[PDB]
Amino acid sequence: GSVKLEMEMVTQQYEKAKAIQDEQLERLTQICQEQGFEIRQLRAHLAQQDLDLAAEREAA
């Protein structure tokens, strides 16, 4: 093969590898975002349940 074909192939391989790395970063980002959402929901539930516990204590 010519030098230009070899240049194209090394460039394509490099860019494919770069894309895979970017995909891994994006997957980590999505995991962190879903965990953040779950944390906010768990905190909301904890706060509400503190209110429910107070209601039962005052009813007793």
Next chain:
Amino acid sequence: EMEMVTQQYEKAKAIQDEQLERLTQICQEQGFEIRQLRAHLAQQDLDLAAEREAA
């Protein structure tokens, strides 16, 4: 010039790897926080059942 390009390449690679490691640590710390929040939620469910039972 090629040697200089390779050194610049490797320094940038090290910075990127460090960033990836920090993201991994952030995700693991969130995992720890989630498990703690679930444990606290379960304990508080027990407390609510105890108060309802006392009533």
